[PDB]
Symmetry: D2
């Protein structure tokens, strides 16, 4: 057997809740699982992706374990993909949870590759703080102002800094354009 399930979406979408839901199902059938977290739900804390494999090799590991949970994958590096693929190759079901976007609206750490490797994708939505539509993005605010493109990706926090928004209501001051004709197109279309 063996496969990867990916639970994702912006902040305030209930990712962790959904992970917990899926894990709680296993208990009624007495199926053992183990959850990892990068350095509340109960979980082994870990410094880097490879340490997961070492822990499973260690004496701490219960041999009956069928399922491996990984929460907040966005804080790992690319090494997590190979770890998750290998675990799935060797009969483990791996359920993974994390943000798909950083505050810029860009792929958060290694998650982009994870979508490719996941057998099952669940992209959850939050509710837009501005208009109430389905929210796909996390927005960061610093004293009421939309955070700048060049600010730090990693910044731990809650509603003090962050809200969930739709596409339309996600704005990043000073976002660059990689395609020469992009700004031209936006101009062209503001003409109506």
């Amino acid at each position: 057997i063996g496969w990867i399930e990916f639970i994702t979406g912006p902040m305030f979408a209930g990712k962790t809740a959904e992970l917990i839901r899926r894990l709680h199902r296993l208990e009624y059938a007495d199926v053992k699982y183990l959850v990892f977290k990068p350095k509340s739900l109960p979980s082994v804390e870990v410094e880097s992706a490879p340490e997961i494999l070492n822990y499973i090799m260690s004496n701490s590991f219960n041999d009956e374990t069928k399922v491996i949970g990984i929460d907040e994958v966005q804080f790992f590096d690319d090494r997590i993909c190979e770890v998750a693929n290998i675990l799935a190759e060797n009969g483990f079901v791996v359920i993974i949870s994390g943000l798909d976007k950083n505050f810029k609206g860009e792929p958060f750490g290694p998650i982009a590759k994870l979508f490719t490797y996941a057998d099952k994708i669940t992209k959850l939505t939050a509710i837009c703080n501005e208009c109430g539509a389905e929210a796909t993005h996390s927005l960061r605010k610093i004293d009421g102002k939309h955070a700048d493109y060049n600010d730090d990706i990693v910044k731990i926090g809650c509603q003090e800094f962050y809200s969930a928004v739709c596409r339309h209501h996600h704005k990043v001051p000073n976002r660059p354009y990689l395609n020469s004709n992009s700004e031209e197109f936006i101009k062209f279309f503001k003409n109506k």
Copy 2:
């Protein structure tokens, strides 16, 4: 706008957890909701609960129409956008009309309940709800016997499977019930309403 979302599946699937998850989302955007529950026993219950941690307030109601009465009453918050209805299986067919009407009048209605009774047949009014729901989420549990995705609730009294003709309604948890796949759902004395069905099962046991 206005629509119906249906969360369903067997027992031990996390239906209530999923309902709570969707309603919790609304709070971070300050969007108001109201949850209803059919009155099952004598206990007054005022929260639905997910073992995920969260609990949300619920109004108890003795029939589907009372939901509309409550929304017309003074207790109703005008800002309410979303109506949650848990354990719909215990309502009668009147719940469909209620839910449709709510959706027609701009409410988002999120509905949770069992699709099957212990016989593996449509539980109360839920069959029609599938039709009316804009969005269907059929969750699974884990089969107690083989670990496959479970689609069925199985009832056992003193270790023996429930007979087909037992009472549909019987409140309880793992002392009576488990979740199972199709293959591991067996109901002693299951009828066949097709004259050729038994014949076909015979024919196929031959190989």
Copy 3:
């Protein structure tokens, strides 16, 4: 193994295209399938046709049990793993037991059909099928009026909305039928089975 997949939605949603798509997949792995169709729908004769891609042959059958008879007959290829059934809404309740039995005996059964009749009510036996289906795909069309996701089929005779009491079965296409959202589905003389429904609709029209 064995399971039921249900493809559903209003008219103009691409249900038959999606059924065909799933069966086409099986051919690249050389997995055999067999497709059934009720007789009343005279739009395609002994084949299943999307207004696209291609079409593929199907056996015509008047009632559900005939499906099992055919599988027991000499005409049946023993290699067949998958049974497709299109336009289920025209069968009666016996189709559910047939589909359950097929899944119990190792067949994958892929089923397509309308969830609503023109009244916006459960079409024939489909309501129970939602319960028995392991997997549900409710597809949408595009609303003829507003371009929203369409969930309903609207029937019109000479531009006039069909009355609630008209005949359920009426074969045809865009001459009679369109796809609409909830808000744009209107049926003259729709009854209310709940004593407080019309009261609620009045109360809410007040704002």
Copy 4:
């Protein structure tokens, strides 16, 4: 409004058929659409030409929906194009392979998953065991094409089949984690 829908999966999964089905729906409501395709529908040499075409006189102003088929052959510039399209009121429906023969992200598609509002990952049927197939497998003379072979190679059943995870095998697959091969050994022990 504006959003991205992404249809993906291995070869033989019906991706194009599903794209076509979604496009057909629009015709019954008279909603106009336009489809693009890369130079291996309007044919195009690179992602930005899409935007240029929409700016040109060839473009019908009533167009609400933009279809993009086999995105895997575009470069990363396609993401920015698709995002920009969605920000300016277009519904963009995108179809392509998620994996190259290696079982690794095909061209730009990995970013697309992140940007798509809606993801539909289709499966094919494993040519080997009949399970859900998630991978495209390449064989020449019945041999599993080596990890180091060319990514781009046009063709059909002559070279390619659809397989589940277990039946996807790449000779000489590297391991970027120092403890990987160790772990695979450890578990071979049972």
